[PDB]
Amino acid sequence: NPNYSFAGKTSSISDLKEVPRKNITLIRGLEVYEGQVSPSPLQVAVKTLPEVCSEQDELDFLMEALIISKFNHQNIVRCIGVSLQSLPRFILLELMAGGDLKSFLRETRPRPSQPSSLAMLDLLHVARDIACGCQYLEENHFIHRDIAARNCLLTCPGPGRVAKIGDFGMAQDIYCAMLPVKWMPPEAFMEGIFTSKTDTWSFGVLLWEIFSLGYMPYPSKSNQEVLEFVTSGGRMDPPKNCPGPVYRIMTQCWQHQPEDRPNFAIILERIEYCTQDPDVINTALPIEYGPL
Numbered sequence: 635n636p637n638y639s640f641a642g643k644t645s646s647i648s649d650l651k652e653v654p655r656k657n658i659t660l661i662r663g664l665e666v667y668e669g670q671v672s673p674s675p676l677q678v679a680v681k682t683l684p685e686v687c688s689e690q691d692e693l694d695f696l697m698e699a700l701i702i703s704k705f706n707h708q709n710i711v712r713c714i715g716v717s718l719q720s721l722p723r724f725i726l727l728e729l730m731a732g733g734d735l736k737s738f739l740r741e742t743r744p745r746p747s748q749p750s751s752l753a754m755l756d757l758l759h760v761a762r763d764i765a766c767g768c769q770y771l772e773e774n775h776f777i778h779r780d781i782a783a784r785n786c787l788l789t790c791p792g793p794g795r796v797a798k799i800g801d802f803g804m805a806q807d808i809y810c811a812m813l814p815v816k817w818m819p820p821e822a823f824m825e826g827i828f829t830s831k832t833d834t835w836s837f838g839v840l841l842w843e844i845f846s847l848g849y850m851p852y853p854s855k856s857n858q859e860v861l862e863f864v865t866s867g868g869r870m871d872p873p874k875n876c877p878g879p880v881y882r883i884m885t886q887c888w889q890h891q892p893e894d895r896p897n898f899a900i901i902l903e904r905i906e907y908c909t910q911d912p913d914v915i916n917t918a919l920p921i922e923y924g925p926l
Contacts, residue, residue, distance in 0.1 A: 636693065638700035641774045650699055651715035653726060658717055668729060671714060678714050679730065683723040692723075699725050701802045709767030711787060711800045732788025732795050735760065739783065739848030742791070745924040754877070754917050756795075757844050758909045760786075763797035765905055768837055769898035771799075772830040779804040779828050781836035782817050783843040806836075815857040816850075820865055821892060831892035837901065838887025845880055846873035847919065877914040879907065 637644050661668040669680040683695045703713040717724040742751050787800035805814050809826055819835035821827040839851050852860045869888050872881040883904050889895045908914045
């Protein structure tokens, strides 16, 4: 019966909104499923706990539910509720029909078949959306410890999409071959120290992911190669066609000392300035060659 504290308030399993299992219908796989909760039922994403799981997996599933349920921000995926009293156990989330941001960027790259699928403003809007969520976490003293394109989701694929932070596993914090080293600042991988300025660093890496249209950070480098590179002052080059003003946000996010990195209010200010600049937003994204 673990307690969870966020923004000075403590909650437990009893605070989670239990939805009767009979009101929940699974529609398709997306494990995660599209579902409906009951003339116009609510469309949801359903995250499931495998019945064949360990006891730690059970506790981790509960904690995930507690964490997400206590956030209240338009750029953090909503929790509709849970169904923990039937098996397999469910967490019911906001349906994000656009899927994860990394997959979206890769699949929606400008190609000859789709020459204007995305523009710079689309990318700056995604960046602003996630920075807004990050500012909310910072203001509420929550350290994400796992900001990355794979952990962000889109409301829909088409125009008007809103990006949100969707996953809260805190993968960077060991307090390893699964460690997301490519998103971690020096103090995190060396000393295991995390603060809101460690989220700033990771946001810089996300910005690179966005403006590269979904490339893996540090092209051709392994995890240890990246660790040694970043420790010695090495930084990524700009993504292809990346405007100078946008690259400078990245390089500010990657200052060696945490105190020299911007907070999320400043990041948002800088993203807004880029969004206003015609030379930035009139920059064409590269076209990835393919058939008509």
